[PDB]
């Protein structure tokens with residue numbers, strides 16, 4: 711399985727894992743799991759400065775690993791398309807490969823406030839990450 715599921719706190723995953731979640735170009739991160747990424751890691755200024763757009767990924771390097779901000783939409787209030795999620799995931803994959811990331815932890819990205827369906831997102835993750843050695847762990851409370 712590409713994806714392993716864990717019930718609990720995403721933020722208690724291994725300190726060596728890289729992390730991922732979805733935000734907008736606005737980097738407001740005011741709700742959902744995002745507000746917890748904001749509290750824990752900050753970095754809003756640095757993220758804004760990367761000037762990443764829908765379908766891209768912004769990245770913070772912290773403690774030797776990476777925190778991926780999947781930029782899946784323009785405004786905080788928008789809802790993403792599957793196409794832009796997929797492009798952001800592909801951007802993360804490319805960065806992972808180039809930088810030797812092998813272990814990612816994430817929530818059920820796109821499938822809370824952003825209204826996507828995990829039956830689709832899971833399959834998308836499997837298709838995007840096939841033929842890599844990148845192990846994904848998905849957390850839920």
Ligand SMILES: Nc1ncnc2c1ncn2[C@@H]1O[C@H](COP(=O)(O)OP(=O)(O)OC[C@H]2NC[C@H](O)[C@@H]2O)[C@@H](O)[C@H]1O
Nearest residue numbers: 732733739741742743744817818819820821822823824
């Ligand atoms: N506080 C908290 N703890 C743990 N898991 C949570 C929490 N809040 C939401 N979730 C879960 O995280 C999953 C993803 O939902 P959400 O956090 O709403 O992320 P989306 O990717 O759907 O939406 C992203 C958008 N919301 C704020 C961002 O900046 C984006 O604008 C999902 O299963 C939610 O139930």
Ligand SMILES: [Cl-]
Nearest residue numbers: 734738739786
């Ligand atoms: Cl946002």
Ligand SMILES: [Cl-]
Nearest residue numbers: 753754755756
């Ligand atoms: Cl900063």
